[PDB]
Amino acid sequence: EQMIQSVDRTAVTGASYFTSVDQSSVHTAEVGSHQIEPLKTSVDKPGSKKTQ
Amino acid sequence: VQINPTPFQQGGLICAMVPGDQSYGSIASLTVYPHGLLNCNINNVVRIKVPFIYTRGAYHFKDPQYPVWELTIRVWSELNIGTGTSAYTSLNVLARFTDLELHGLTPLST
Amino acid sequence: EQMIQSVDRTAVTGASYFTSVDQSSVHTAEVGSHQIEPLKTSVDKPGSKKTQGEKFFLIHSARWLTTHALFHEVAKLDVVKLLYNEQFAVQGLLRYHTYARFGIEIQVQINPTPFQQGGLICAMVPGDQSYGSIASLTVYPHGLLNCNINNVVRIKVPFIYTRGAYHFKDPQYPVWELTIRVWSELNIGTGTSAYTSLNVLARFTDLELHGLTPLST
Amino acid sequence: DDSGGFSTTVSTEQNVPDPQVGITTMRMDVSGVQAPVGAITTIEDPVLAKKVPETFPELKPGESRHTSDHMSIYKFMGRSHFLCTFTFNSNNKEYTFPITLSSTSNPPHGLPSTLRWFFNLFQLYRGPLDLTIIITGATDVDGMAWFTPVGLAVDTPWVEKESALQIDYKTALGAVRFNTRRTGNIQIRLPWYSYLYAVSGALDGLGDKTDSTFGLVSIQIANYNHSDEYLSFSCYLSVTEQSEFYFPRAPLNSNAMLSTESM
Amino acid sequence: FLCTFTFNSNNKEYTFPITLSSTSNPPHGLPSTLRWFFNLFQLYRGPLDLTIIITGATDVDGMAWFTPVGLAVDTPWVEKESALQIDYKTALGAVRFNTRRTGNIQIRLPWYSYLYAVSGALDGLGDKTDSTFGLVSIQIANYNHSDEYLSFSCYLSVTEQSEFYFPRAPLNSNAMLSTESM
Amino acid sequence: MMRNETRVSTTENVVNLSNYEDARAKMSFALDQEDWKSDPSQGGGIKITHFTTWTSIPTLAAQFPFNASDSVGQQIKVIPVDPYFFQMTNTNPDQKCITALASICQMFCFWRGDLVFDFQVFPTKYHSGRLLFCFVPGNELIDVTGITLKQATTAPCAVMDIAGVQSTLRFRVPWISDTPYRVNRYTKEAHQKGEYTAIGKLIVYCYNRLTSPSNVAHHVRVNVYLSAINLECFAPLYHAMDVTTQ
Amino acid sequence: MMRNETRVSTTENVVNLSNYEDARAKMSFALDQEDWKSDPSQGGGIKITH
Amino acid sequence: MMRNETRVSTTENVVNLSNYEDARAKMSFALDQEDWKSDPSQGGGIKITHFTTWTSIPTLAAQFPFNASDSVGQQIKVIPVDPYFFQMTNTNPDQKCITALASICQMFCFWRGDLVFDFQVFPTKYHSGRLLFCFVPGNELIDVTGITLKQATTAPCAVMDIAGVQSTLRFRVPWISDTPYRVNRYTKEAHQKGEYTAIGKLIVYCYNRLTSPSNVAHHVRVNVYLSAINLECFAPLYHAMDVTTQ
Ligand SMILES: [Cl-]
Ligand SMILES: [Cl-]
Ligand SMILES: [Cl-]
Ligand SMILES: [Cl-]
């Protein structure tokens, strides 16, 4: 007997200090990925706690 | 992007992350852009994640050229209901940066 | 912790070209199984595409006379179009498929009395005879008939067309136009029958049907 | 997620570029006598939506009769398509037209037909372009042409007038000279010389004025006594292998697809 | 040999179809050898190397494009002002040339058709859709008729990628026609 | 004794932009004839190179309503089966919303493959009904109004229960034709028997009437996306397909 | 120092259709200059050549 | 049977001087087509081949004075950050003294890299003071007069004690931009938001007022040289940059 895929109702997302609880959820869509400048547009250390 | 339609409501929306401007793109082809579809009978949330997409190597805050992203949210299927149900649903939008690369400390403000 | 069985909501069923999606489903009930006749009730091959579609059928039938001059066309037939007709079983297959590709086998026969003389030529010409030289009909898949010799001829061909299949309900141009002309005037002696009837048999070969349809025209 | 984010459900790729080939080939059946599970899905969910569609039993298509795949952008746009056309009226004059993706700028003062369409299928473009231009009419007319990069001096666009630029300056940016008698056509490559990372067609006013341009071309005639015939110029562009295309957009709606109707 | 035509006014165009049809009699149809050949068999498919000779005029800019069966294209066998967007024309793949610098063009015609193959011997209906390889259109420009006349002659040659299926009875002599000229 | 002779062949100084082999430049403006490497810096790695990219992204081609007033076997919507189809449109900004699938194929003379119709329902967990999707093999112009629902079950088709945890039924219309490819006749003045754009028409019937209480809409809307798989197009051309006003 | 010189021989831009070697096209309308395979599908394998 | 045919391609007898591949001669006047060896005889071995040669030689771009009368936090001089800058000039012989750095970059459309400002003080072992050099990231036109000295410490900057055994502070301005390269807009009629030549402006503030006795000047002059490292320019053009009158 073949089981047929059905979405996942409940789920929990967030980042840093922000959390979300969703009851009628679905999956997250993403496209492409992080790209690293083969030729940097700026040579200074990227902003960081220490930087600033 | 999230909302809260009561199961007695029906219809849906579409949320698209469009770079720069919608220009004259076919509304019906919004699905092409990184999108999320909302259907009452189904989901009440959608999540989209993208990288840096621009003509320049970075965005200038103090005085921008053109917006990096123009998030558009349109009615994908008219929101009808039965007599008595709430005739609306509020909606919110959450955003956050990812892989944040800052450059050039400055005293300006505008 | 014991899990207790609960039905399977969503599911998908169907057969051949019919699919169903059901949301508040349940399982299918069946009883017994297929039984094979220990004593067959009928000995003929059970109906099959070949049974009913790839067999022979009588298309057209005419007369050949002493009055018919040389090259007289005794018959011009859209073989395919002719088969497509309730009159023959193969219809049952065609009548419900939009297009189909295939080969053909033609058998033409007659019955001249040895006291008759002359002959005919039968050619399977694709599309139309156009302005081809009647005298060169032998080039097409043909069969020659000579009283003093044979009273039958058989030709077999594959699918030859500009399109990948023939459209029955509403054709473009006939696949095959079988032509039968007088190859040598049919003369006789005073008293002999001045004619001979003639028949034409046809059947499909390697019948490939496509796209079930409810139409009729 | 390296960004300090967390989730309980997954995140798959949505609308992935170059998913399948464009020519009928085998990269048995394609689906059948099994059970079409791909006949049902919850399109709202990105994962599920990628589930391969299948409704009825089909067989493998087979092999296409032609060599190359017409759906490969490189090969398709490899056919130099139409760009613009203009005509000189007086002698010792010049015309300067910009190469602008802008969906806004309507022809003739803008991208037309195919080129217009194509450059709005995606957000970012960069890389050289093989321009080729056909000369019509006149003869024994000496001419010159030069490519001017975005952000530099150049005679006023879409306008026939007497050049206001030092011969030195012109030639300096790299130029070419030719004569109608000996040729009647020129195929030269345009460089990816821009201070930007890439250019785009779909933009809004401001950026639509700086970041929507590859560069500009300028053609200047000479020795054209108008006692002669007329002098027409037609330009066509073809994408090169060193050209890149990033991020797919929703195609321009039909009402915005315009063409310079002529003959 | 295939066909030949002549321009009378400036900025005009001619569009001729490549039709095997035994029906269509020249000049508005296949002539001499080509006519004969394409009726020796039932089905044809595969590219064809067209080559065209220019006669007369000079310093005349011209353009030509191959249009596949079943698509928009200026009315056949007729000299008239084109009714097609320059865009459209060029889009189907085209070529430009000038009488002064050349006087002849040899380019290959593609097997671009929704059919499996085409045929000459047919009957009316099919004889209107399945009897055509495709069409060629030539448009002139800068031809002040104060000048000489402008003639065009087209010839076809079969390629190795061309195929020929099923032999027919050759056309009877009475149907073999030729565009008698010089 | 310098002796390299060559004959000047035909087509002298002729120009051809049909393909790249002849369209590519013969010299360059670039200094030292240099070239360029790749660079996805601000392109997020999403490098495009094939139109498939679009043709496989379900885009919205049409919206139709399913009313309770619709009785069993009533034809609800009829659609021709060819990539070029789309009927969506917005008043102001005034525009004709072509689909991705369409916007691509519109630039080709020929096409073949499995078109994919995705039906998305927008009901409420309180409605109930079934719709029968039916593909009638043929051409873009076949009178089909004379077809009982029953009659339609002869052609390949599928039924869908709306009330559910799922929302979309996918209709993968198998390439069925008498020809290897169909043509973009949508450019021609009139129509000619045999020069077809579609392989048949799709029909939406009311399988089981739409039931429901009274505190929910008296109907249920449906979105119809369109995309293709095993798609093949060839013979470039230019044409901005208009809207197919059903 | 680019130095590839050739002399323009007789019969400049002359056309000859006597044989294929000179009759064959010198360029093509086909996209990407592609070609075509064989296909006897509807030709019943009866391929003619002589 | 001589049979070498070639087709005459497009661009017949066309001339292109964009690069050497097409600019180089196709024949020579030299007898027997000979060539020449090298010879540094009277060239002292100093053979040149790259413009870097100049762009890395600090040249004088500007002179500014530091007066005692200048109070703490007073802006003393403001400079745009782009190779094209220079303000030096002599009355007679009448001339506009461009810098090496400048004279090179002026012939390019684009540039990127670390510009280097060298500050040379001309004091006496009896003065005492500090100056704060501040780079404000941006474009060549940003109102900056509204910036407290304090406010400036937010941007990258450096302070220098004048009184000393050393004489020059080097300011290596890191390439900071929203674009991979900046453009030579100094050729255009007007200015357009986004088409910038510099990556920001440099500012000279008075960190600690200039102290001293009374038998020494009431001020101290300063030379500002300019050169670049990791410099890159491309897209040749011609333009004689004028003076940037601050
Ligand atoms: Cl002359
Ligand atoms: Cl003027
Ligand atoms: Cl000449
Ligand atoms: Cl007219």
Side-chain angles (χ1 to χ4, degrees):
Chain A
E1 177 161 50
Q2 297 167 299
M3 205 93 85
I4 176 47
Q5 289 291 51
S6 80
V7 55
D8 300 344
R9 270 292 187 59
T10 62
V12 163
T13 50
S16 181
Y17 288 122
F18 183 110
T19 303
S20 176
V21 200
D22 297 347
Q23 290 256 38
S24 310
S25 163
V26 60
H27 300 72
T28 60
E30 171 174 43
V31 285
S33 74
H34 181 305
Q35 295 311 305
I36 60 176
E37 310 192 301
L39 165 46
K40 293 165 168 62
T41 60
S42 279
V43 283
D44 56 323
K45 282 189 167 188
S48 85
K49 191 242 296 171
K50 304 186 179 178
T51 299
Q52 184 197 311
Chain B
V1 161
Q2 37 205 175
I3 60 189
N4 272 280
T6 170
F8 278 116
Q9 284 181 298
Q10 64 190 85
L13 310 161
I14 175 179
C15 306
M17 280 297 277
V18 186
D21 192 65
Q22 302 197 51
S23 174
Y24 304 120
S26 176
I27 286 303
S29 282
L30 281 153
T31 48
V32 178
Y33 303 109
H35 72 305
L37 285 184
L38 288 167
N39 181 316
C40 296
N41 169 49
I42 299 300
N43 64 304
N44 76 287
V45 175
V46 283
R47 306 189 200 77
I48 302 183
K49 181 145 59 185
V50 305
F52 195 59
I53 302 304
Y54 209 53
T55 44
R56 290 184 147 79
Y59 186 73
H60 180 182
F61 296 119
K62 311 297 172 298
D63 161 46
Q65 198 67 173
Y66 70 77
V68 177
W69 294 111
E70 193 177 80
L71 192 192
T72 178
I73 298 187
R74 287 183 159 73
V75 182
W76 210 226
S77 185
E78 296 166 62
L79 170 64
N80 293 76
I81 62 176
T83 48
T85 315
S86 293
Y88 63 116
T89 171
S90 43
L91 168 160
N92 286 302
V93 165
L94 290 179
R96 81 188 185 88
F97 288 110
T98 64
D99 313 289
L100 185 39
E101 303 175 37
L102 305 177
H103 284 293
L105 307 171
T106 171
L108 312 162
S109 307
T110 287
Chain C
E1 177 161 50
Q2 297 167 299
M3 205 93 85
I4 176 47
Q5 289 291 51
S6 81
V7 55
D8 300 344
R9 270 292 187 59
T10 62
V12 163
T13 50
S16 181
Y17 288 122
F18 183 110
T19 303
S20 176
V21 200
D22 297 347
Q23 290 256 38
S24 310
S25 163
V26 60
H27 300 72
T28 60
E30 171 174 43
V31 285
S33 74
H34 181 306
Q35 295 311 305
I36 60 176
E37 310 192 301
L39 165 46
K40 293 165 168 62
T41 60
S42 279
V43 283
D44 56 323
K45 282 189 167 188
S48 85
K49 191 242 296 171
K50 304 186 179 178
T51 299
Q52 184 197 311
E54 295 184 48
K55 103 158 195 160
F56 276 141
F57 302 87
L58 178 52
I59 302 308
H60 166 50
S61 38
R63 286 69 193 179
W64 176 22
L65 293 80
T66 57
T67 76
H68 290 304
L70 180 53
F71 294 155
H72 173 67
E73 209 166 0
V74 201
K76 179 153 71 73
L77 311 67
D78 180 344
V79 192
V80 218
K81 191 170 190 179
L82 272 139
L83 295 169
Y84 191 90
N85 167 48
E86 304 183 60
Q87 267 187 168
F88 323 106
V90 56
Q91 164 95 302
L93 304 184
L94 317 178
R95 187 196 200 318
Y96 295 101
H97 287 76
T98 295
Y99 326 116
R101 77 193 287 273
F102 50 82
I104 301 299
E105 189 177 311
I106 302 301
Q107 213 165 314
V108 161
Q109 37 205 175
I110 60 189
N111 272 280
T113 170
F115 278 116
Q116 284 181 298
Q117 64 190 85
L120 310 161
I121 175 179
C122 306
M124 280 297 277
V125 186
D128 192 65
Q129 302 197 51
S130 174
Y131 304 120
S133 176
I134 286 303
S136 282
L137 281 153
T138 48
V139 178
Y140 303 109
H142 72 305
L144 285 184
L145 288 167
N146 181 316
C147 296
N148 169 49
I149 299 300
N150 64 304
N151 76 287
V152 175
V153 283
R154 306 189 200 77
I155 302 183
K156 181 145 59 185
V157 305
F159 195 59
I160 302 304
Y161 209 53
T162 44
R163 290 184 147 79
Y166 186 73
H167 180 182
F168 296 119
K169 311 297 172 298
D170 161 46
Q172 198 67 173
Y173 70 77
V175 177
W176 294 111
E177 193 177 80
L178 192 192
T179 178
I180 298 187
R181 287 183 159 73
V182 182
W183 210 226
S184 185
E185 296 166 62
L186 170 64
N187 293 76
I188 62 176
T190 48
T192 315
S193 293
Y195 63 116
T196 171
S197 43
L198 168 160
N199 286 302
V200 165
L201 290 179
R203 81 188 185 88
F204 288 110
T205 64
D206 313 289
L207 185 39
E208 303 175 37
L209 305 177
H210 284 293
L212 307 171
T213 171
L215 312 162
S216 307
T217 287
Chain D
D1 184 66
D2 209 300
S3 303
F6 45 79
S7 174
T8 84
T9 52
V10 204
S11 65
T12 52
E13 264 197 299
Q14 179 168 64
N15 295 32
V16 177
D18 308 347
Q20 183 189 64
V21 184
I23 205 166
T24 301
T25 174
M26 305 182 180
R27 42 70 191 187
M28 301 184 160
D29 296 348
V30 184
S31 61
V33 210
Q34 160 53 71
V37 45
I40 184 55
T41 177
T42 305
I43 194 181
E44 294 75 358
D45 177 295
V47 185
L48 294 177
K50 286 159 67 178
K51 184 198 296 174
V52 177
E54 40 166 45
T55 304
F56 303 92
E58 311 180 2
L59 293 79
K60 291 180 184 171
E63 290 297 305
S64 180
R65 292 310 73 181
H66 56 95
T67 315
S68 316
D69 171 0
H70 291 226
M71 289 176 89
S72 164
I73 305 170
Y74 285 144
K75 301 186 181 301
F76 182 99
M77 290 305 338
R79 172 174 281 183
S80 205
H81 289 77
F82 181 69
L83 170 35
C84 72
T85 178
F86 50 85
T87 52
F88 280 98
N89 317 299
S90 55
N91 189 52
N92 284 64
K93 294 298 187 300
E94 149 278 294
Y95 197 69
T96 298
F97 69 103
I99 286 179
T100 295
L101 306 177
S102 175
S103 313
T104 297
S105 300
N106 308 302
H109 288 181
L111 258 180
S113 74
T114 310
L115 306 191
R116 180 193 190 63
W117 170 77
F118 174 89
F119 283 108
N120 287 289
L121 285 181
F122 55 119
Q123 192 59 44
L124 313 179
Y125 174 77
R126 98 187 198 83
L129 289 172
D130 290 333
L131 157 54
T132 88
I133 62 190
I134 309 167
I135 298 178
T136 309
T139 170
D140 266 66
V141 189
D142 205 73
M144 166 183 90
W146 65 102
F147 182 99
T148 320
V150 275
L152 297 153
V154 58
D155 287 299
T156 59
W158 310 112
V159 170
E160 169 180 353
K161 81 171 186 183
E162 172 178 351
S163 177
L165 292 179
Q166 316 172 294
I167 165 58
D168 320 272
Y169 180 63
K170 294 190 180 69
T171 65
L173 324 192
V176 296
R177 276 234 219 160
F178 56 101
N179 181 303
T180 72
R181 174 175 265 285
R182 303 113 192 174
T183 180
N185 52 62
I186 302 155
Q187 282 184 291
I188 188 178
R189 177 174 286 192
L190 312 192
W192 173 225
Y193 292 176
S194 187
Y195 68 87
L196 301 164
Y197 156 86
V199 290
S200 167
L203 287 160
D204 64 355
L206 175 53
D208 224 85
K209 191 168 184 177
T210 42
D211 299 38
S212 59
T213 307
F214 186 67
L216 306 69
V217 167
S218 320
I219 297 179
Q220 180 175 289
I221 52 70
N223 182 60
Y224 170 35
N225 191 44
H226 192 49
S227 62
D228 297 304
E229 36 213 358
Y230 60 84
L231 190 43
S232 300
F233 276 79
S234 303
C235 310
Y236 307 71
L237 280 181
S238 196
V239 59
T240 71
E241 51 291 297
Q242 288 174 55
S243 302
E244 297 190 292
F245 321 103
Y246 298 88
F247 200 146
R249 287 184 63 85
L252 289 179
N253 88 271
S254 284
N255 271 172
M257 269 170 246
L258 318 171
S259 38
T260 44
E261 43 201 53
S262 283
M263 45 189 112
Chain E
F1 181 69
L2 170 35
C3 72
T4 178
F5 50 85
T6 52
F7 280 98
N8 317 299
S9 55
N10 189 52
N11 284 64
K12 294 298 187 300
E13 149 278 294
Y14 197 69
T15 298
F16 69 103
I18 286 179
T19 295
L20 306 177
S21 175
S22 313
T23 297
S24 300
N25 308 302
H28 288 181
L30 258 180
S32 74
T33 310
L34 306 191
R35 180 193 190 63
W36 170 77
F37 174 89
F38 283 108
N39 287 289
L40 285 181
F41 55 119
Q42 192 59 44
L43 313 179
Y44 174 77
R45 98 187 198 83
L48 289 172
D49 290 333
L50 157 54
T51 88
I52 62 190
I53 309 167
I54 298 178
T55 309
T58 170
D59 266 66
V60 189
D61 205 73
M63 166 183 90
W65 65 102
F66 182 99
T67 320
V69 275
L71 297 153
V73 58
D74 287 299
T75 59
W77 310 112
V78 170
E79 169 180 353
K80 81 171 186 183
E81 172 178 351
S82 177
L84 292 179
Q85 316 172 294
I86 165 58
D87 320 272
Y88 180 63
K89 294 190 180 69
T90 65
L92 324 192
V95 296
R96 276 234 219 160
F97 56 101
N98 181 303
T99 72
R100 174 175 265 285
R101 303 113 192 174
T102 180
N104 52 62
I105 302 155
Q106 282 184 291
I107 188 178
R108 177 174 286 192
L109 312 192
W111 173 225
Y112 292 176
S113 187
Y114 68 87
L115 301 164
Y116 156 86
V118 290
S119 167
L122 287 160
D123 64 355
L125 175 53
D127 224 85
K128 191 168 184 177
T129 42
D130 299 38
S131 59
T132 307
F133 186 67
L135 306 69
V136 167
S137 320
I138 297 179
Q139 180 175 289
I140 52 70
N142 182 60
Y143 170 35
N144 191 44
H145 192 49
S146 62
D147 297 304
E148 36 213 358
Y149 60 84
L150 190 43
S151 300
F152 276 79
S153 303
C154 310
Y155 307 71
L156 280 181
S157 196
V158 59
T159 71
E160 51 291 297
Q161 288 174 55
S162 302
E163 297 190 292
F164 321 103
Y165 298 88
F166 200 146
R168 287 184 63 85
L171 289 179
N172 88 271
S173 284
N174 271 172
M176 269 170 246
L177 318 171
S178 38
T179 44
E180 43 201 53
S181 283
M182 45 189 112
Chain F
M1 182 169 125
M2 194 300 162
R3 169 163 276 285
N4 293 316
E5 71 178 313
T6 43
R7 164 163 64 80
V8 169
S9 177
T10 73
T11 40
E12 193 186 319
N13 186 65
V14 173
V15 174
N16 164 26
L17 351 74
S18 305
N19 59 59
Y20 193 64
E21 295 59 42
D22 295 310
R24 46 172 179 157
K26 274 65 177 173
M27 60 178 87
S28 159
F29 263 129
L31 179 51
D32 194 53
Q33 197 135 286
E34 62 179 353
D35 309 304
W36 292 253
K37 295 175 179 174
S38 175
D39 183 354
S41 292
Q42 329 317 335
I46 309 180
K47 182 173 183 176
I48 311 183
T49 88
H50 211 311
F51 292 127
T52 315
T53 277
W54 294 262
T55 70
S56 59
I57 297 311
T59 24
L60 178 39
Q63 163 150 156
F64 75 76
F66 178 8
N67 303 279
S69 52
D70 301 329
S71 39
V72 186
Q74 191 176 314
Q75 281 181 171
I76 297 179
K77 183 45 158 294
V78 59
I79 308 306
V81 192
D82 68 281
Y84 313 114
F85 174 98
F86 85 92
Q87 79 176 199
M88 287 304 99
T89 174
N90 176 288
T91 57
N92 184 304
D94 316 55
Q95 69 160 44
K96 302 181 183 175
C97 319
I98 185 175
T99 56
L101 174 55
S103 197
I104 297 288
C105 307
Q106 74 184 317
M107 303 301 288
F108 291 92
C109 308
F110 309 110
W111 77 268
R112 84 185 304 298
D114 299 315
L115 281 170
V116 175
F117 293 110
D118 293 298
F119 296 93
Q120 175 181 51
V121 311
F122 290 91
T124 71
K125 298 179 175 53
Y126 315 91
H127 293 83
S128 182
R130 276 162 178 292
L131 293 187
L132 190 168
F133 296 101
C134 171
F135 171 50
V136 179
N139 56 53
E140 68 257 26
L141 41 78
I142 58 181
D143 199 312
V144 62
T145 59
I147 300 190
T148 51
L149 171 49
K150 308 190 183 188
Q151 273 189 298
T153 65
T154 258
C157 37
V159 300
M160 197 210 92
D161 185 2
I162 342 304
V165 299
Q166 221 74 336
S167 70
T168 315
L169 172 163
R170 322 199 80 173
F171 207 63
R172 177 162 174 175
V173 187
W175 174 261
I176 324 297
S177 164
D178 53 315
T179 94
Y181 311 80
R182 269 291 192 276
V183 65
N184 191 322
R185 189 201 47 61
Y186 285 111
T187 50
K188 278 199 171 193
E189 315 74 54
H191 320 292
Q192 189 54 288
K193 183 68 75 68
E195 281 179 8
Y196 307 135
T197 74
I199 48 178
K201 305 183 183 188
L202 179 42
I203 301 177
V204 164
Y205 285 102
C206 167
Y207 200 57
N208 279 332
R209 316 191 51 200
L210 179 50
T211 65
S212 83
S214 52
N215 43 316
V216 290
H218 44 290
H219 62 275
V220 184
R221 283 197 170 68
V222 176
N223 277 334
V224 188
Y225 301 75
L226 195 43
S227 39
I229 181 177
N230 292 181
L231 169 54
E232 180 186 304
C233 305
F234 77 104
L237 78 76
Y238 168 106
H239 172 72
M241 180 73 267
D242 189 10
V243 170
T244 334
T245 51
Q246 59 186 312
Chain G
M1 182 169 125
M2 194 300 162
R3 169 163 276 285
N4 293 316
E5 71 178 313
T6 43
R7 164 163 64 80
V8 169
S9 177
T10 73
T11 40
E12 193 186 319
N13 186 65
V14 173
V15 174
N16 164 26
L17 351 74
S18 305
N19 59 59
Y20 193 64
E21 295 59 42
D22 295 310
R24 46 172 179 157
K26 274 65 177 173
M27 60 178 87
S28 159
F29 263 129
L31 179 51
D32 194 53
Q33 197 135 286
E34 62 179 353
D35 309 304
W36 292 253
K37 295 175 179 174
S38 175
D39 183 354
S41 292
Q42 329 317 335
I46 309 180
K47 182 173 183 176
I48 311 183
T49 88
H50 211 311
Chain H
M1 182 169 125
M2 194 300 162
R3 169 163 276 285
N4 293 316
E5 71 178 313
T6 43
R7 164 163 64 80
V8 169
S9 177
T10 73
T11 40
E12 193 186 319
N13 186 65
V14 173
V15 174
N16 164 26
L17 351 74
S18 305
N19 59 59
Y20 193 64
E21 295 59 42
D22 295 310
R24 46 172 179 157
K26 274 65 177 173
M27 60 178 87
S28 159
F29 263 129
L31 179 51
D32 194 53
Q33 197 135 286
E34 62 179 353
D35 309 304
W36 292 253
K37 295 175 179 174
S38 175
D39 183 354
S41 292
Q42 329 317 335
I46 309 180
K47 182 173 183 176
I48 311 183
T49 88
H50 211 311
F51 292 127
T52 315
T53 277
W54 294 262
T55 70
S56 59
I57 297 311
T59 24
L60 178 39
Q63 163 150 156
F64 75 76
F66 178 8
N67 303 279
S69 52
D70 301 329
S71 39
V72 186
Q74 191 176 314
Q75 281 181 171
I76 297 179
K77 183 45 158 294
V78 59
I79 308 306
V81 192
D82 68 281
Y84 313 114
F85 174 98
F86 85 92
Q87 79 176 199
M88 287 304 99
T89 174
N90 176 288
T91 57
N92 184 304
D94 316 55
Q95 69 160 44
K96 302 181 183 175
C97 319
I98 185 175
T99 56
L101 174 55
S103 197
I104 297 288
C105 307
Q106 74 184 317
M107 303 301 288
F108 291 92
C109 308
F110 309 110
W111 77 268
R112 84 185 304 298
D114 299 315
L115 281 170
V116 175
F117 293 110
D118 293 298
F119 296 93
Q120 175 181 51
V121 311
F122 290 91
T124 71
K125 298 179 175 53
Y126 315 91
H127 293 83
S128 182
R130 276 162 178 292
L131 293 187
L132 190 168
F133 296 101
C134 171
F135 171 50
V136 179
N139 56 53
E140 68 257 26
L141 41 78
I142 58 181
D143 199 312
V144 62
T145 59
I147 300 190
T148 51
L149 171 49
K150 308 190 183 188
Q151 273 189 298
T153 65
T154 258
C157 37
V159 300
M160 197 210 92
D161 185 2
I162 342 304
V165 299
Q166 221 74 336
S167 70
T168 315
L169 172 163
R170 322 199 80 173
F171 207 63
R172 177 162 174 175
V173 187
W175 174 261
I176 324 297
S177 164
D178 53 315
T179 94
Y181 311 80
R182 269 291 192 276
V183 65
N184 191 322
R185 189 201 47 61
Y186 285 111
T187 50
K188 278 199 171 193
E189 315 74 54
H191 320 292
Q192 189 54 288
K193 183 68 75 68
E195 281 179 8
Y196 307 135
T197 74
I199 48 178
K201 305 183 183 188
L202 179 42
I203 301 177
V204 164
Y205 285 102
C206 167
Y207 200 57
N208 279 332
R209 316 191 51 200
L210 179 50
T211 65
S212 83
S214 52
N215 43 316
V216 290
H218 44 290
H219 62 275
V220 184
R221 283 197 170 68
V222 176
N223 277 334
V224 188
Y225 301 75
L226 195 43
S227 39
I229 181 177
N230 292 181
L231 169 54
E232 180 186 304
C233 305
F234 77 104
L237 78 76
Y238 168 106
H239 172 72
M241 180 73 267
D242 189 10
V243 170
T244 334
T245 51
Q246 59 186 312

